[PDB]
Structures are given as C-alpha cells and as structure tokens.
Design a binder for these strands. Structure first.
Ligand SMILES: [Zn+2]
Ligand SMILES: [Zn+2]
Ligand SMILES: [Zn+2]
Ligand SMILES: [Zn+2]
Ligand SMILES: [Zn+2]
Ligand SMILES: [Zn+2]
Ligand SMILES: [Zn+2]
Ligand SMILES: [Zn+2]
Ligand SMILES: [Zn+2]
Length: 127
RNA sequence: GGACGAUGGCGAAACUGCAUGAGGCAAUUCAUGCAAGUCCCUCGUCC
C-alpha cells in the first residue's frame, strides 16, 4: 500500500539496530530518494542487484557510534497527499533538515527545488 | 497572504489519477500516452 514508508521504516529500524545495510524491493522512486539521501550525507551508498527482483541495498551511516539519520518521517502518503508551491516549501528554519520533494524535474531536496523555482509533493523529512 | 474568475497558456511531467500494454497475469514492478490532481507562469477582480 505504501512502499515509501517501508523504505523509511527500514532505514529507521536499521539505524536503531546498528545494521550496516538494509535491503528491499527496488523502485525508480526509491532509487530517486536513495540518491538524494546520499548526496546529503544520510547514507554511505545504495546499489541495485538482480533483474527479475531488483533488490535495493542501502549502506547506512554512522558517526563514530551514532546513527546519522536522527529522524525520518513520511509527510505525503496515499491517504493524505501533501503538496507545496515553491514559496510554501520549508523556508530555512530546521537547521539540517532536508525535505525530499518530487517535482516535475525530478526528486530533489527542498533547497534544490527552491533554486529551480518549483514546488511539488513532499515525500518526507530527514534530519 | 487569503477567496475566486480569463478563450487562461500551445508551459513542466517526478509523483497521483485515467487509458493501453508487459510482467506465476496475486506485484512493494515496468513501458507508452493524457494532462484532471500537482507544480510553473500570465491577465483580471474581490477582502
Ligand atoms: Zn496548497
Ligand atoms: Zn504564493
Ligand atoms: Zn498577495
Ligand atoms: Zn492570492
Ligand atoms: Zn485556470
Ligand atoms: Zn507534454
Ligand atoms: Zn493496468
Ligand atoms: Zn508507476
Ligand atoms: Zn508515467
């Protein structure tokens, strides 16, 4: 029903149990999210394995004994879709939070969207 | 900022939705297309 929550739950859980990696069925959206999470220091790497069932492998990150991801939350969900115009996006108040946004030019951070002059669906918050 | 209206635009297409197709035809899936949702932008009014 909500394949993104599984991603986020899996990350959340992985980091609570100090698992070095978590793996899950892939999608193009998941890979897009994994890509942003990487650019922004939240995971070490992601990769995709096999063809029939693509598994997505995320390598979690630890800062000398901690989890780098302090909280990862769904915002938009099938059930309650959340969208923001460019001007409505986070305005720089959470001081390390990124919102992950799906825009008509791809999945990017709330900062990158602001810079492109786009709003979009808010997939999650990570901090 | 908020509440609407233009023949709105020869606008974008990631996501949602719709439609077709493919996948033990149960997909946590994928391809093409549309452009209603969603986003950008223009004119006008109204608090
Ligand atoms: Zn809105
Ligand atoms: Zn505005
Ligand atoms: Zn105004
Ligand atoms: Zn207004
Ligand atoms: Zn209109
Ligand atoms: Zn088009
Ligand atoms: Zn179908
Ligand atoms: Zn799809
Ligand atoms: Zn599509």
């Amino acid at each position: 029903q909500d394949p993104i929550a599984d991603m986020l739950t899996r990350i959340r859980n992985g980091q609570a149990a100090n698992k070095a990696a978590v793996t899950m069925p892939s999608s193009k959206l998941k890979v897009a999210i994994a890509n942003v999470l990487k650019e922004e220091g939240f995971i070490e790497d992601f990769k995709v394995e096999g063809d029939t069932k693509p598994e997505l492998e995320l390598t979690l990150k630890y800062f000398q004994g901690k989890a780098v991801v302090e909280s990862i939350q769904r915002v938009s969900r099938p059930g309650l879709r959340i969208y923001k115009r460019k001007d409505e996006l986070p305005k720089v108040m959470a001081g390390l939070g990124i919102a992950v946004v799906s825009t008509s030019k791809g999945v990017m951070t709330d900062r990158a969207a602001r810079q492109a002059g786009l709003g979009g669906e808010i997939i999650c918050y990570v901090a």
